[PDB]
Design a protein around this nucleic acid. Structure first.
Ligand code: NA
Length: 91
DNA sequence: AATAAGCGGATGTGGG
DNA sequence: TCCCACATCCGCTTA
């Protein structure tokens, strides 16, 4: 199954949910979720994974926090903003 | 208060 | 066995 950081990177490349997520500085890998439309994107993640329960932005962000150590995605000190690692962007 | 984002420990589930 | 890569639950903190 596709990994969460890859799901998000794929969405940013396709632009299929442009109203839910967007690049801030794509060269730096920084991206931001929509305050009002992030739940629709979270729902899509859960359906793609076939999880038992409805996915929520809160649970999706809890999963993102677990990348902080290994570095695939880091939280930026801006609202709803995150940053992919160079390695993630390179692949 | 109402609303929202942030934080993260503890535990449960998948598929190796 | 026991790690992977989250999912889920819960409560606290900050704005
Ligand atoms: Na929020």
């Amino acid at each position: 199954k596709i990994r969460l950081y890859q799901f998000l990177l794929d969405l940013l490349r396709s632009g299929d949910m442009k109203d839910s997520i967007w690049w801030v500085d794509k060269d730096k890998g920084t991206f931001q979720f929509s305050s009002k439309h992030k739940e629709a994107l979270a729902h899509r993640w859960g359906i793609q994974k076939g999880n038992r329960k409805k996915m929520t932005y809160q649970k999706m962000a809890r999963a993102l926090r677990n990348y902080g150590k290994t570095g695939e995605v880091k939280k930026v000190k801006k609202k709803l903003t995150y940053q992919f690692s160079g390695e993630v962007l390179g692949r």
